[PDB]
Amino acid sequence: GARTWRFLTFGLALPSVALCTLNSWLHSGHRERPAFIPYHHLRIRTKPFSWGDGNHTFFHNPRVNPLPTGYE
Amino acid sequence: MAYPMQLGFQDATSPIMEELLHFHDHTLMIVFLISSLVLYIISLMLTTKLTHTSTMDAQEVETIWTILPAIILILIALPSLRILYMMDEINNPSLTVKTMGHQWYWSYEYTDYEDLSFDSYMIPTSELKPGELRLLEVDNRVVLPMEMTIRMLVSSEDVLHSWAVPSLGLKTDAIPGRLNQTTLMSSRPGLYYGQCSEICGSNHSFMPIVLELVPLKYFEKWSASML
Amino acid sequence: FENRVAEKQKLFQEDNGLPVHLKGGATDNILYRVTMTLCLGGTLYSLYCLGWASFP
Amino acid sequence: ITAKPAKTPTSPKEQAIGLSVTFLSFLLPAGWVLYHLDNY
Amino acid sequence: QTHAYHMVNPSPWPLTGALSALLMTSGLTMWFHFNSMTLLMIGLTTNMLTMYQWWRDVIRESTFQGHHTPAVQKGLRYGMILFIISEVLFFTGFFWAFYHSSLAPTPELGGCWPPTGIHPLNPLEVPLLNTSVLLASGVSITWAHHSLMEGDRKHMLQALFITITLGVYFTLLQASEYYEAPFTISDGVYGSTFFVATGFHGLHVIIGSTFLIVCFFRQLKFHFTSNHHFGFEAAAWYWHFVDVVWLFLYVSIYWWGS
Amino acid sequence: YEEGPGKNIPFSVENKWRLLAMMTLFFGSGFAAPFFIVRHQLLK
Amino acid sequence: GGGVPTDEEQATGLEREVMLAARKGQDPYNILAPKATSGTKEDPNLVPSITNKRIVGCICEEDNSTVIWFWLHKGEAQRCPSCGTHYKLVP
Amino acid sequence: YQTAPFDSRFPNQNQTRNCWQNYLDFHRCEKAMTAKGGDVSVCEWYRRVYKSLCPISWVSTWDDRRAEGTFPGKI
Amino acid sequence: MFINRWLFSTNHKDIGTLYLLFGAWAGMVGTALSLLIRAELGQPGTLLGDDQIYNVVVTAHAFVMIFFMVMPIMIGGFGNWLVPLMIGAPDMAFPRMNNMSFWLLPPSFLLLLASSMVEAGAGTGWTVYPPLAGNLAHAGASVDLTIFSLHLAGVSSILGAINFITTIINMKPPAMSQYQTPLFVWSVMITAVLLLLSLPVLAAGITMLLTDRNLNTTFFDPAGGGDPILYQHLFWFFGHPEVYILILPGFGMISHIVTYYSGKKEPFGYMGMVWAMMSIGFLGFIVWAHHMFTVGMDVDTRAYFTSATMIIAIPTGVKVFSWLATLHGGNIKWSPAMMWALGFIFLFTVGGLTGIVLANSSLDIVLHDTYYVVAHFHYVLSMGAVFAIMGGFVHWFPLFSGYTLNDTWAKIHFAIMFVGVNMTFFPQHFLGLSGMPRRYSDYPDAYTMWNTISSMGSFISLTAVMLMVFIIWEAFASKREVLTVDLTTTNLEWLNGCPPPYHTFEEPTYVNL
Ligand code: HEA
Ligand code: HEA
Ligand SMILES: CCCCC/C=C/C/C=C/C/C=C/C/C=C\CCCC(=O)O[C@H](COC(=O)CCCCCCCCCCCCCCCCC)COP(=O)(O)OCCN
Ligand SMILES: CCCCCC/C=C/CCCCCCCCCC(=O)O[C@H](COC(=O)CCCCCCCCCCCCCCC)COP(=O)(O)OC[C@@H](O)CO
Ligand SMILES: CCCCCC/C=C\CCCCCCCCCC(=O)O[C@H](COC(=O)CCCCCCCCCCCCCCC)COP(=O)(O)OC[C@@H](O)CO
Ligand SMILES: CCCCCCCCCCO[C@@H]1O[C@H](CO)[C@@H](O[C@H]2O[C@H](CO)[C@@H](O)[C@H](O)[C@H]2O)[C@H](O)[C@H]1O
Ligand SMILES: CCCCCCCCCCO[C@@H]1O[C@H](CO)[C@@H](O[C@H]2O[C@H](CO)[C@@H](O)[C@H](O)[C@H]2O)[C@H](O)[C@H]1O
Ligand SMILES: CCCCCCCCCCO[C@@H]1O[C@H](CO)[C@@H](O[C@H]2O[C@H](CO)[C@@H](O)[C@H](O)[C@H]2O)[C@H](O)[C@H]1O
Ligand SMILES: C[C@H](CCC(=O)O)[C@H]1CC[C@H]2[C@@H]3[C@H](O)C[C@@H]4C[C@H](O)CC[C@]4(C)[C@H]3C[C@H](O)[C@]12C
Ligand code: CUA
Ligand SMILES: [Ca+2]
Ligand SMILES: [Zn+2]
């Protein structure tokens, strides 16, 4: 019935989300970025991207995404 | 190489190509018979004024139509798979040669002992010596010892190619980042021709393979001269 | 909110010969003309782009 | 199948015209291109 | 007619939809090669106009005109199941690419998975939260369904609002993950499989959420009866599909692939 | 909409010679197109 | 906790006609397969039509894959040309 | 030594990993024998096998990457 | 009224007519491309002087014949015209979505002809394998336009598959079980299931190729840890089902034509015909790597793919023998349609048997990427599909149009086409056995005689195509209106006259239990 699925929604499902939110928010701090190594299997550039200067990924994050030549 | 008005396979130069010839003869007899039976039966169904247009029971005849083809397929598959597992059996090669495909030529590496390598380009039609073959000759042939088991390793430095020599039963794709192995054994000296067998762009028709099969003593003298 | 489905049933069942995509009234005509003009104009623009791209 | 007599019968001469025009519509344009391949 | 099937009024939307596909594809070509977004924005606009007017007309035909007899509704049920099957096989191709690359990592990667230089996301942090969010949304949408069948307007709307909220939460969490990820789509086959498979999934979450929002507004306008609400059922089936694809991504790419 | 032979098609068969022109343009345009594409590529 | 309309309140057009006819045990929109009579000249299968002819398909024997199709005309009962089963049109 | 023998670890048509494993083995051994000033003659079998099997351009690329600090395998 | 009828259609017959017109036009394009191939191969040395152009012509030839000629004609044309009529349904389930499956094809075709007109075209083969199809070896828009052409064709067929499956399951008379539907309807249902499952995998694969070309993914690029061979698996996981998609509706049409002109009420062994098509459909998903016997896979894998492939001969043989057993005892009418169907049974059998030769991986090493493969598929696919289409076209032309063909002209057309295709393709077996590679713009001198004969055959088939256009003109020119057709008791599609009214089965059939 509706009553049972509402009971599962508020009594199991949303409490689970609350506990996973608490878990995530406890481990949300920034990790120290790893030394840059210009590995040839990473930072692939076979064609410039169709935006910006052609060398930045679409959700480029300067703090954690080095360019082929390293961290900005 | 192929000759004018050729109907079948190039003469076998390796034991496995011999096996494939016998296997093809067996399978072609079956293809012929089944093709002929279907044509004949069409002609038999079409050549009588006698009629039977009421519902026909199919159960009994469908046993024949499934069992007899099943047996025929088994009679093809048995020798088929025997040859497949022969062309897989462990052999001791005495030589390893690499070939790398390029747009549009082959390179060869003989690196068992010395770093010997060279490029093999098609002889242009305008440069053929009298009696030489259009689209098939190269400047540098793949010199190999006859009557010996050779490991060929095949790769590419650009797009896909495929390294083929029909008279030896050989076709191995040349894939960048992959090293494919095949075994080569010639029963005979001579020149054995093949052609790039994966579409690799505009000059796919124009990057042939020429093997030069000579006795071991002559192979050794040639290797030594390369130094 | 109130249940006004009966009033929409009356509008969309009116015997006026309109096809369902135009039966809501003048706004349907405007939205259809915008859509068809963008599609046909866009298609003409795509052919011009083909013409341009077909030569060095 | 059975059919009514042709409403607008196509005489042998009319068929020769239809066939000739049909063949020429395929042959003439391809012919023009293949003939001028040299010029390309 | 003395059959129960729907003879549809002649419609321009098939042609506008087909032309929208031409403009989006020629538009992507003109963006990737000829440094221009114009055709692509016209195509996206005409696609959205086509989908709006086509699905508006289906609501007109069903809620307002009464054309969805039981036979018609049974057809639409088959249609939506078959559509979902086609979407499962599309995802299967991306899972095949993932397992091909990860089960036989090449020398270029270091012969290992994850590849040398890849620092995967901790699957126990946001990816686990995302899992709890979509599983919870499967529970709330089931509550919505039962509320509707039982004739309860208020609780159907509350349950459906909670489902949409969880869908939006998943989308904002994934957007944040994307930005925080220290690897990109250009980080070899690891980045390729990660972003294309999770990216197509995120697209389907946005589509599914948009479908639920359409159902929310139809419910606000009293379109659904306690017995007749196929748009709601189709959106629920689609939503369960989106959940299940997530569970397979989570186990495969985030967990087994870490 | 018009029903019956010659009336369930997007082209007219009222006049066999106009029809011959339309069918010639229709099939001939399709057959010609590849010859003209090859010419276009050769002329680059 | 109410506020959701019922089919009885809100179904319209052909959906409603189908809904009302099913309440009365009637099948004007041909959703159900009709049950055969013995099909004799005295007890022919009665084929409803809004007009003066209707296509009949005869599955002569259970599990026949072949259906026999013909126009049944108003007037004297006609017989399936395969099994001879009688059919009578009832405008 | 004539050529690389059959290796039961790599029995199929795809010999990529045979080339890669013997290149790794040679370089791991060479680094172990230099890290006590040991003797690199101990590493000879791996050297002959990778030299026999590996494409020159692969060997040359891997060598360049070891020198650059971008070789993705563990040595 | 013209735009409402022909651009805004929700009518299965008019949409079927649009598909037939589209497919006939595409067939002219595909035929012109085939004649350019054979003009180049007709003499040793170069004709075009541009082997990239040769490769573009071969690539376009395949895409046009498969996606724009065969599939639109068989599924969009015959499927939309006949399926609703054969089950007494008033239209398709989704009559407006049906119209969008049609209208996606002209834009799909425009993208293909844009690919060939920009840069140097896509000279990739219809397989579009990377890295040749990648952004180094095919820089520029041509391959991207080819990928987008396939996306639009893919969506058209996926939505069409959903429409046919739903129509066939949901819109029969309530008394009619699946085991009382005509074999053509079964053949379309099974084709639609193959489309629904296979095309999404192709869509995934070509989308990966698009991202490798434009977004710096490396699915198929070993530098990023990708693999060209992954593309081949995804392509052929679709591609094998695709070749059964191309023939299955042909099998359905052949069953109806053989039954009709044998004067029979029913095909021999109906449930065996259903079993055989379902078996072929199922086995069609587990054989794809027989397109990959030379890429370096494991011996046990090659053994499995050889064995699984050969199994398809068993259900296929049941259909061939069942067609023969439908002829058996018939009052045979030697109609032009019957000639096409008899030609089909023989030529299809020859090509199927060369398929069984190729199934043997050992022999396939020597036959792969040679003219033996080209000979195989032009028998089973090119002649099979084409002969089934021509048989269906001359059989059902009077239903669709209301007019009769000249049967003598139609027999002349059959005779020319039979000579042409055999002269074209039979010698390609010899070229393949003797080692002539496929996808070659030029060939060693030894191969000249059989290439010369093959090219001469291609012109004979051209003469047949031109004659076919004349024959269609003559039928519309003369206006012989259909009066009677026999066997309507077992061919429901004819029972509403020629042509049937715009709306049929407004009053559904009566079928009791
Ligand atoms: C259905 C598929 C189909 C059809 C019909 C054809 C038809 C033809 N094909 Fe081919 N072909 C392929 C599919 C097809 N082909 C594919 C998949 C390839 C591989 C490409 C690759 O390697 O990547 C290929 C490749 C191929 C090659 C190998 C090229 C090379 O390897 O370099 C050759 C060589 O001669 C060839 C020739 C022909 C010829 C001469 C015809 C025809 O001229 C034969 C006669 C047939 C007709 C003339 C068609 C008639 C039909 C109509 C006009 C429709 C009418 C419509 C109605 C009645 C409604 N084709
Ligand atoms: C209509 C399309 C169609 C159909 C139906 C088939 C049917 C079959 N095909 Fe073919 N095939 C193609 C179209 C088709 N093919 C195309 C387009 C390619 C090339 C793609 C490309 O590279 O471009 C190809 C390539 C292809 C290959 C790859 C070859 C290579 O590239 O090296 C192989 C390998 O096994 C294969 C095998 C078969 C088999 C076993 C069948 C079976 O289904 C045939 C079964 C039929 C019979 C056997 C005949 C009737 C049976 C009897 C009378 C019973 C008795 C018979 C026996 C006992 C044997 N085909
Ligand atoms: C938040 C959850 C979900 C968000 C959805 C995505 C938002 C933007 C784009 C939407 C469309 C996405 C669908 C899948 C396509 C490809 C890439 C999408 C995945 C994505 O968003 O990936 C991003 C890259 O996007 C990129 O390149 C560019 C992306 C834009 C261009 C894509 C164009 C390609 C379109 C392909 C069309 C194919 C359609 C298939 C039709 C098949 C029918 C049969 C990842 O960012 P990054 O900086 O590399 O790494 C993060 C580093 N901090
Ligand atoms: C910013 C946003 C960016 C994203 C944009 C991309 C697209 C988003 C679109 C989201 C989909 C919205 C679909 C709305 C459908 C509304 C019409 C509807 O739901 O119509 C219903 C029928 O269902 C039907 O046709 C069922 C119709 C099913 C439609 C299924 C749609 C899934 C679409 C997926 C799109 C393809 C994705 C592929 C990507 C690779 C009507 O019947 P009932 O509900 O029974 O009502 C009748 C009762 O009132 C009588 O008492
Ligand atoms: C790179 C970019 C290339 C992409 C190009 C995109 C291609 C085309 C543009 C798409 C435009 C779509 C516009 C809306 C279409 C809605 C169709 C729909 O909803 O169709 C419904 C049927 O399909 C059903 O239900 C179930 C099916 C609903 C399907 C909705 C559309 C999906 C389109 C893309 C999906 C491809 C699949 C992804 C997996 C490969 C309704 O059928 P109708 O005949 O209308 O009405 C019947 C009446 O009785 C209703 O009252
Ligand atoms: C109602 C129907 C819809 C009709 C469609 C209307 C078409 C509009 C025509 C505008 O054309 C644009 O011109 C821009 C400027 O000329 C181009 O800019 C681009 O190209 C420039 C070339 O100089 C570059 O600077 C940049 O890449 C970029 O700004 C762009 O490609 C192109 O679209
Ligand atoms: C692949 C299928 C193709 C099959 C071949 C078709 C058969 C040939 C058809 C005739 O085509 C014509 O041939 C003429 C030559 O006979 C050409 O005239 C050319 O040559 C004439 C005389 O040399 C000049 O008067 C003209 O100006 C000149 O264009 C003309 O352009 C061309 O339309
Ligand atoms: C009534 C219908 C009206 C139709 C009007 C169409 C709407 C767009 C018209 C302007 O076209 C734009 O022009 C920009 C240049 O002027 C392009 O810059 C593009 O190219 C830039 C190059 O600098 C890049 O930064 C970006 O891709 C981008 O801004 C942009 O792409 C392109 O769309
Ligand atoms: C007052 C109004 C009554 C709706 C009606 O019966 O017409 C109620 C019923 C259910 C309500 C919705 C549900 O409670 C769920 C949401 C609760 C949030 O706190 C506000 C928005 C929210 C989406 C509500 C908006 C609005 O207050 C609704 C729509
Ligand atoms: Cu190299 Cu083909
Ligand atoms: Ca030539
Ligand atoms: Zn009966």
Round to whole Å and give the CA distance between E20 and E90: 22
Please state which CATH number belongs to domain B92-227: 2.60.40.420
DSSP class of residue I176? -
Rg from Cα positions in chain B: 24
**How far apart are the CA of F39 and the centre of ligand 7, in A?**
15
Q: Is I61 a catalytic residue?
A: yes
For every residue of I384-401, DSSP letters joined together read: HHHHHHHHHHHHHHHHHH
d(CA B175, CA I230): 12
Asked whether the bond before B208 is cis by omega within 30 degrees of 0, the reply is no
Domain span at residue E213 reads 68-258
Domain count, chain A: 1
Question: Rounded to an integer, what distance in angstroms lies between the CA atom of residue I89 and that of residue I253?
Answer: 19
Indicate left, alpha or beta for G75 from its phi (over 0: left) and psi (-120 to 50: alpha).
Answer: left
Task: List helix spans (H) across E60-187.
Answer: 70-103, 126-149, 153-180
Nearest to F29 by CA among I202, C6, F37, B190: F37
- Please give the Cα distance from I359 to I250 (Å, whole number): 23
- Kindly write down the DSSP assignment for every residue of H7-50, as one continuous string: -TTS-SSB-HHHHHHHHHHHHHHHHHHHTTT--GGGGHHHHHHH
- The residue type found at I495 is L
Class of domain B2-91: mainly alpha
Instruction: Assess contact for I53 and I121: CB atoms under 8 A.
Output: yes
**CA gap I85, I508 in Å, rounded:** 11
Instruction: Look at residues E26, E41, E67 and tell me which one is the last residue of a structural domain.
Output: E67
Total domain count, chain E: 2
- For residue I409, give the amino acid letter: W
| Tokens matching residue I173 | 């008379």
Domain termination residue (choose one: E67, E97, E115): E67
D7 touches chain I (CB under 8 A): yes
Mutation pick for ligand 8 pocket among E23, E26, E34, E36 (CB with most ligand atoms within 8 Å): E36
Q: Which amino acid is at B222?
A: W
Strands G53-58 and I510-511: parallel
Q: Which amino acid is at I101?
A: S
d(CA I439, CA I421): 19
- Domain locations along chain D: 1-40
User: In terms of CA atoms, which chain B residue is nearest residue H5?
Assistant: B92
Q: Kindly report the three-state secondary structure assignment for every residue of chain B.
A: CCCCCCCCCCCCCCHHHHHHHHHHHHHHHHHHHHHHHHHHHHHHHCCCCCCCCCCCCCHHHHHHHHHHHHHHHHHHHHHHHHHHHHCCCCCCCCEEEEEEEECCEEEEEECCCCCEEEEECECCHHHCCCCCCCCCCECCCEEEECCCCEEEEEEECCCCEEEEEHHHCEEEEECCCCCEEEEECCCCCEEEEEECCCCCCCCHHHCEEEEEEECHHHHHHHHHHCC
Helix, strand or coil, per DSSP, at residue G3: strand
- Asked if A55 and A17 count as a contact pair (C-beta separation under 8 A), the reply is no
Q: Is H54 in a helix, a strand, or coil?
A: coil
Give the rounded distance of the alpha carbon of H33 from its chain centre: 15
Residue E93 shares a structural domain with residue E166? yes
- Cα gap I462→I36, rounded to integer Å: 12
Q: Could you say which of H16, H20, H72 has the minimum Cβ distance to residue E115?
A: H72
CA atoms within 13 A on the CB side of I108: 27
CB contact under 8 A, E79 and I171: no
Give ion ligand 12 contacts, CB < 5 A. Answer: G 58, 60, 68, 80, 82-83, 85
Q: Which residues surround ligand 11, an ion (CB under 5 A)?
A: I 40, 43, 47
Q: How many angstroms separate the CA of residue H6 from the nearest CA in chain A?
A: 31
Q: Is I281 annotated as contributing to ligand binding?
A: no
- What does the alpha-carbon distance between residue B208 and residue B194 come to, in Å, rounded to a whole number? 6
Q: How many whole angstroms from C41 Cα to the centroid of ligand 6?
A: 14
DSSP assignment letter at E109 = G
Residue I255 annotated to the active site: yes
Q: Which residues of I480-508 are buried (b: 16+ CB within 10 A; e: fewer)?
A: bbbeebeebbbbbbbbbebbbeeebbebb
Tokens of B188: 């005979």
- Asked if D40 lies within 8 A of F27 by C-beta distance, the reply is no
> Domain coordinates of chain H in residue numbers?
1-75
Contact A44, I212 (CB under 8 A): no
Is residue I357 a contact partner of residue B31, using CB atoms and an 8 Å limit? yes
- What residues contact I192, with CB distance under 8 A and at least 6 apart? I75, I160, I161, I162, I164, I165, I168
Crossing angle for the helix pair C26-53 and I105-117, nearest 10 degrees?
Answer: 20
Q: Are E246 and E201 in contact (CB under 8 A)?
A: yes
Residue among I164, I159, I25 nearest I86 (CA): I164
Run of H or E including E150: none
Domains and CATH numbers, chain I: 2-513 (1.20.210.10)
Q: What residue ranges do the domains of chain G occupy?
A: 1-91
Dist CA E228 CA E76 (whole Å): 12
Q: Which residues pair with B139 in a beta bridge?
A: none
E106 in contact with B, Cβ within 8 Å: yes
How was this structure determined? It was done by: X-ray
User: Is residue I254 within 8 Å of residue I390, measured between CB atoms?
Assistant: no
The answer to whether B32 and I357 have CB atoms below 8 angstroms apart is: no
**Taking a C-beta distance cutoff of 8 angstroms, is the pair G68, G85 a contact?**
no
Residue to probe by mutation, ligand 9, list E157, E158, E220, most atoms within 8 Å of CB:
E157
Interface test with H, best of I298, I302, I362 (most H CBs within 10 A): I298
